[PDB]
């Protein structure tokens, strides 16, 4: 739901207000534990509704799944227990930014560095870090490798000193070769 600020109102949810009611009940139980049936009966709830509340209270981390013996409440009885890196570069006078940027990538070596981590380490803007990487690619001093991590197909950059020996090269080259085999042994 999108509300323009003038019209912003905190819309509740049926499960939320019932979870709060169950929390009020359980927190006022001296043990903070009650059986599901009583927790339903205290609110007249059907099991179909209540099992959402139970699992939402669990998923919210507000309560824990527990079972107590009937002689412990006074048979095992199901219950709810309520509970509630790269160092930056000191840019030097005597070297151009491409020399200084290649030195950073050399100090990374086999593990490489992304454009975003170059950007922070060099203390430059997004467009400026981008141009540095494009030039270092075309000068053939740095080799770029893709790495999927999280949601992002980030590029990582490695100097041609370490590029061939790098993990990203070795991993990619194996899966490339394996792919070219599998596709060529697939029938024409």
């Amino acid at each position: 739901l999108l509300l323009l600020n003038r019209f912003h109102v905190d819309r509740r949810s049926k499960y939320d207000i019932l979870m709060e009611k169950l929390s009020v009940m359980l927190s006022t139980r001296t043990n903070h534990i009650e059986t599901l049936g009583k927790l339903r009966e205290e609110l007249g709830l059907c099991e179909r509704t209540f099992k959402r509340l139970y699992q939402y209270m669990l998923n919210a981390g507000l309560a824990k799944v527990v079972s107590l013996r009937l002689q412990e409440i006074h048979v095992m009885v199901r219950c709810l227990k309520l509970l509630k890196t790269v160092p930056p570069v000191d840019i030097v006078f005597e070297r151009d930014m491409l020399t200084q940027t290649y030195d950073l990538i050399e100090r990374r070596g086999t593990k490489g560095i992304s454009q975003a981590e170059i950007r922070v380490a060099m203390n430059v803007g997004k467009l400026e870090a981008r141009m540095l990487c494009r030039l270092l690619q075309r000068f053939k001093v740095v080799k770029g490798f893709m790495e999927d991590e999280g949601r992002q197909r980030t590029t990582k950059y490695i100097s041609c000193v370490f590029a061939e020996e790098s993990d990203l090269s070795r991993q990619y080259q194996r899966e490339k070769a394996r792919s070219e085999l599998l596709t060529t042994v697939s029938l024409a």
Binding site: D90, I91, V92, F93, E94, R95
Partner: protein, 154 residues
């Protein structure tokens, strides 16, 4: 007569007159008469006192100079810190060695027509391998060098 087109040279010739007229208007022959050098403020350091300031390379890299249209000399030159090769007898270029990588340099100005001896002031960093972060003050020891080039008449 130098072989460039006249329309390429014409701004060059024009700039001579414009510079001379500017200097006649807006340079001067004397200023800061209060600040004449006093010899008692110029203390000569002894050899063992000077040694911390001297730039650290004692001999230049080996080099050779090829000049277009001359025969190949083929010798490698090398020269001591604070020493110079002789000017080429026909083309008058000179190389000299300052003991470290040069990071400032200016000509001593002389009033036009003085025909004086010409000098340059320069700074060459102590160590070839040093490189200094801009974000931090340094305050180390160093040396300012004055080199005399002669009067440079033909």
């Amino acid at each position: 007569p130098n072989g460039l087109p006249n329309h390429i040279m014409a701004p060059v010739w024009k700039c001579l007159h414009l510079t001379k007229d500017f200097r006649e208007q807006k340079h001067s022959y004397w200023e800061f008469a209060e600040w004449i050098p006093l010899a008692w403020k110029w203390h000569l350091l002894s050899e063992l006192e000077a040694a911390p300031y001297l730039p650290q390379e004692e001999k230049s890299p080996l080099f050779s100079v090829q000049r277009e249209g001359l025969p190949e000399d083929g010798t490698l030159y090398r020269i001591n810190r604070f020493s110079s090769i002789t000017a080429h007898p026909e083309r008058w270029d000179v190389s000299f060695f300052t003991g470290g990588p040069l990071w400032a340099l200016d000509w001593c100005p002389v009033p036009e027509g003085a025909g004086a001896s010409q000098y340059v002031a320069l700074f060459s960093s102590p160590d070839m391998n040093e490189t200094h972060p801009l974000s931090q003050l340094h305050s180390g020891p160093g040396l300012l060098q004055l080199w005399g080039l002669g009067t440079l008449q033909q």
